[PDB]
Amino acid sequence: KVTMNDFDYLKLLGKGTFGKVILVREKATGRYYAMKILRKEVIIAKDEVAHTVTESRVLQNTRHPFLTALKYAFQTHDRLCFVMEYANGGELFFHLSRERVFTEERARFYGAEIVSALEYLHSRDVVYRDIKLENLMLDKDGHIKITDFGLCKEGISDGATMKTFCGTPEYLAPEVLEDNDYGRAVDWWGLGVVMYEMMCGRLPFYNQDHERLFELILMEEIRFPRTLSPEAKSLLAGLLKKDPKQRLGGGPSDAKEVMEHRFFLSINWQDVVQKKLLPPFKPQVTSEVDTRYFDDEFTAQSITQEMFEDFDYIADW
């Protein structure tokens, strides 16, 4: 058993919709982690208990360099909690905001590592459904760490389908904005939105009203900056094909179509997953408590079964 007070609560990394992630230290080993702290009341109140359960099951059965690995999960008389590897580098949305845009090559690095994680997830019959900049953290070495498995769905092999209207509005695939069911190709759409943002420096579709936003996703053709390379334009045009069947990654071969697209011609997919490739950026941290790649907005704050039968967990590593 692992206890709330096995952990120092050092710095508030993130807080909101989800819950509260805090940079902690393990009192025993002195190791550093990010601990997502959820209130059981909030979860039950909202029916979305199966998501907070599925998140645990997925973090327990997935192992990949570009997925956040779970160290321990447990609960208390009031709260569900996950302890996960800490990504010192912040998230890409933070870096992108500052940089405004990445180079194609830099976008290709993060893209390849995402294509890597998603191929792996799809191989395990998991659909992630929430690919967005905000969920893409960087670790201490500048490698992608996918984060927030709330909306995942298991059991999704090949042409199996899903029905939950979920995801993040700006990132929704068109098919998800129609009635009935959709498949795993929503993740490739999602990949296209983050890649477009990386290379073009904005979302391909945006309105602050969701009805207009949804209209844009369903009805508007993407635009590309003139200077974007033909290979980049092609990649984006494939991933953000509105028809999932015409979409790059939408065929029966899933990730293989994306991996074999010419944008990725220079990638050795074995070297990616084996992190042999030199990152384009490594976050410069002085200490373990150096939270410069998180908003001072959030960090400068102070801080204080039947249903969850399959939630608790401890790692072999």
Partner: peptide, 10 residues
Amino acid sequence: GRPRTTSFAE
């Protein structure tokens, strides 16, 4: 800026 986003589930 480009505002932040928040996932949902109907």
